[PDB]
PDB file of C-alpha atoms in Angstrom:
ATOM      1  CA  UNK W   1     -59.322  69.400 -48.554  1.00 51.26           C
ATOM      2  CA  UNK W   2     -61.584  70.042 -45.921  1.00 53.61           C
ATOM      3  CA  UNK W   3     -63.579  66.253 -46.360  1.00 57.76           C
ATOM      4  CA  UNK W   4     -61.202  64.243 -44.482  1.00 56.56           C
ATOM      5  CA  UNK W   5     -64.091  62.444 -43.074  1.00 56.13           C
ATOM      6  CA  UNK W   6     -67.589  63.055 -44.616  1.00 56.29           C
ATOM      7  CA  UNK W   7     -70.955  62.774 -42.594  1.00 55.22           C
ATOM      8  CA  UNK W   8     -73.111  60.268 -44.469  1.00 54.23           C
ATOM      9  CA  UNK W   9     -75.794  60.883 -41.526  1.00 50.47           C
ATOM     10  CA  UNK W  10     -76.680  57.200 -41.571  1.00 50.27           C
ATOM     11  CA  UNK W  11     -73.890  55.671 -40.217  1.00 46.99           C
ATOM     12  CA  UNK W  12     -74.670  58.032 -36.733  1.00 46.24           C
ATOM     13  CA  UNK W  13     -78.148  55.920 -37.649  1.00 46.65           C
ATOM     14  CA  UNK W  14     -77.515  52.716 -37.891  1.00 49.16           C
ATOM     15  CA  UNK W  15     -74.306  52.853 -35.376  1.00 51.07           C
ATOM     16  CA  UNK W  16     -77.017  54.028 -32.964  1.00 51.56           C
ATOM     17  CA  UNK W  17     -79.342  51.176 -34.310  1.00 53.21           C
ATOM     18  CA  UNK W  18     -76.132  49.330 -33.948  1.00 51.93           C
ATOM     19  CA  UNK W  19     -75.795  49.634 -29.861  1.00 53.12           C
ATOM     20  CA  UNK W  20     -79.358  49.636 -29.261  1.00 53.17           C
ATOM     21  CA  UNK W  21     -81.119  46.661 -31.275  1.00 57.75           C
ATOM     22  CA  UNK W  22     -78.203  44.143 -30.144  1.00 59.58           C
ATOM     23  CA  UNK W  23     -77.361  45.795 -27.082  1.00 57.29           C
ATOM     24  CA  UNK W  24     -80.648  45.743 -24.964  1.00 55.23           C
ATOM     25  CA  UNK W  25     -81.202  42.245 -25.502  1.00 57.93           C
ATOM     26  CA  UNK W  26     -81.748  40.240 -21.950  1.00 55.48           C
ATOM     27  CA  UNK W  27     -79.517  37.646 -21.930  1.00 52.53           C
ATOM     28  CA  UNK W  28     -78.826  34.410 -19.368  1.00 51.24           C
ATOM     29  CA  UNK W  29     -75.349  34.803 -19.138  1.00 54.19           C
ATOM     30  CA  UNK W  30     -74.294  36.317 -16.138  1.00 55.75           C
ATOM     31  CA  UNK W  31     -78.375  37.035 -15.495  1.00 56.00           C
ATOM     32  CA  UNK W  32     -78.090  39.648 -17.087  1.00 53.51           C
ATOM     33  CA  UNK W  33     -82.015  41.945 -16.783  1.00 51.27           C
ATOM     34  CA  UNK W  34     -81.069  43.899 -19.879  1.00 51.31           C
ATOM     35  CA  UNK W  35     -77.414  44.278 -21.664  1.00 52.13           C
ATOM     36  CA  UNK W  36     -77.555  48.613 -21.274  1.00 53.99           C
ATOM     37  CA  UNK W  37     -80.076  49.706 -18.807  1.00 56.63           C
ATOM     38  CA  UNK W  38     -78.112  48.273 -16.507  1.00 57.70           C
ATOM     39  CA  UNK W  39     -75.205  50.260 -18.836  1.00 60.41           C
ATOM     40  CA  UNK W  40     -77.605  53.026 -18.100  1.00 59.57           C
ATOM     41  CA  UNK W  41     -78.411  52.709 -14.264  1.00 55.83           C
ATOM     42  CA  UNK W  42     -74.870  54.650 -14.034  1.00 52.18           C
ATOM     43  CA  UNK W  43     -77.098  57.679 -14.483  1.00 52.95           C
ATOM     44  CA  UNK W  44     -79.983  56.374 -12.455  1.00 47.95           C
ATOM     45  CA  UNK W  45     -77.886  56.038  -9.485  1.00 48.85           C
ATOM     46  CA  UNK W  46     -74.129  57.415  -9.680  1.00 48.35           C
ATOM     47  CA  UNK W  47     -75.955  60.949 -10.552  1.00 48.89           C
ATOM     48  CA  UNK W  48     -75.196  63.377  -7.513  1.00 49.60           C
ATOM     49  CA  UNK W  49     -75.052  66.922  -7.991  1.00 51.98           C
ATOM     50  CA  UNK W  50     -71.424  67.976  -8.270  1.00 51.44           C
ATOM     51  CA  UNK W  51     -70.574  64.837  -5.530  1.00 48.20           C
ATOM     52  CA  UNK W  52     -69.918  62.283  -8.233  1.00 48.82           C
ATOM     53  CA  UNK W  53     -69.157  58.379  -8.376  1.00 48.67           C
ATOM     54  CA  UNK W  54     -66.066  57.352  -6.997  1.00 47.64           C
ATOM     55  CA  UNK W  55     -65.296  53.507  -6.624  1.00 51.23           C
ATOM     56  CA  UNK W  56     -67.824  52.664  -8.185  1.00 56.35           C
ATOM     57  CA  UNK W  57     -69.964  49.919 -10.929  1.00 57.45           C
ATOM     58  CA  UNK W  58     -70.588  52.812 -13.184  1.00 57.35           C
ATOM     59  CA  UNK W  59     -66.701  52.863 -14.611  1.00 60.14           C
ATOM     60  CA  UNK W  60     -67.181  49.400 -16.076  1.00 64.18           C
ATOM     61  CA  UNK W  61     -70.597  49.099 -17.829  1.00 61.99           C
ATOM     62  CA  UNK W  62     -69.575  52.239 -19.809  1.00 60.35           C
ATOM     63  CA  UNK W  63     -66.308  51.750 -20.477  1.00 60.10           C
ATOM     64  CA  UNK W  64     -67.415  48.269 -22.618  1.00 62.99           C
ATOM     65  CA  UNK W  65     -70.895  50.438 -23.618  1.00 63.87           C
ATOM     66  CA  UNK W  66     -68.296  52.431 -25.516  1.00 65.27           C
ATOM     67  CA  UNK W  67     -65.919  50.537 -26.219  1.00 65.02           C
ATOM     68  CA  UNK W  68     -69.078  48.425 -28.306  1.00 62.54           C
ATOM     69  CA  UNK W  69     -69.954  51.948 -29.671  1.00 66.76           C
ATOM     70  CA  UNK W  70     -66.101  52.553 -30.989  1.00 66.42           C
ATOM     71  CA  UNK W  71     -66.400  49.520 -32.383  1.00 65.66           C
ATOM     72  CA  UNK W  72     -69.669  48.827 -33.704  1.00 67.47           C
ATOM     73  CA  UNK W  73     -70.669  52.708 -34.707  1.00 66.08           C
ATOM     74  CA  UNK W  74     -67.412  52.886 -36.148  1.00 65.49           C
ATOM     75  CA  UNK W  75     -67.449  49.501 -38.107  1.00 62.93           C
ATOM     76  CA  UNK W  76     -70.321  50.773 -40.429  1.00 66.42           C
ATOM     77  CA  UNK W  77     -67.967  53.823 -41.123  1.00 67.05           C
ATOM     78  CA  UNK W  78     -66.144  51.500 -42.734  1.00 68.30           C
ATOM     79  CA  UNK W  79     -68.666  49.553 -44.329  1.00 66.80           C
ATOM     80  CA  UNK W  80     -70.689  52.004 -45.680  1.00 67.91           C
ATOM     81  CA  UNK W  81     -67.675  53.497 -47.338  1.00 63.85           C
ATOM     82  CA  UNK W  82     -65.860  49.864 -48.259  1.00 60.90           C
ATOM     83  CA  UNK W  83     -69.031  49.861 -50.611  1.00 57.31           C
ATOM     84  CA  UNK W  84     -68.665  53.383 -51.582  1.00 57.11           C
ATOM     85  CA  UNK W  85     -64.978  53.066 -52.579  1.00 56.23           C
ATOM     86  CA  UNK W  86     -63.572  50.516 -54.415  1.00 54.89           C
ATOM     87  CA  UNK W  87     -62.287  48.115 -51.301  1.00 55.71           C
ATOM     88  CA  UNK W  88     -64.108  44.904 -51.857  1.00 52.40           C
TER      89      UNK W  88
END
């Protein structure tokens, strides 16, 4: 009891080295300027005191910025305990 998941505060690391390092690369597809400030300009922009974003670009940009955080921060939680345990 009471470890049903265990910290490991490296994983919270590298899952933020995770979405960082590979995410803000500029890339030519799409032209993209940067892969998460753009992510990011959600909060440069959509910001309005107690007014917020409807219809807007912010919903998308996050909602994959996420989505490659649940799956990329998450996939270490795995793989740090797949080497832990006795998995592979």
């Amino acid at each position: 009891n009471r470890d049903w998941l265990r910290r490991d505060l490296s994983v919270i690391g590298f899952g933020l080295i995770g979405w960082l390092a590979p995410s803000s690369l500029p890339v030519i597809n799409g032209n993209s300027l940067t892969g998460l400030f753009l992510g990011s300009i959600g909060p440069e922009l959509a910001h309005f005191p107690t007014g917020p974003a409807l219809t807007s670009p912010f919903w998308l940009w996050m909602v994959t910025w996420h989505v490659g955080l649940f799956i990329v921060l998450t996939f270490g939680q795995i793989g740090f305990k797949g080497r832990q345990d006795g998995y592979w």
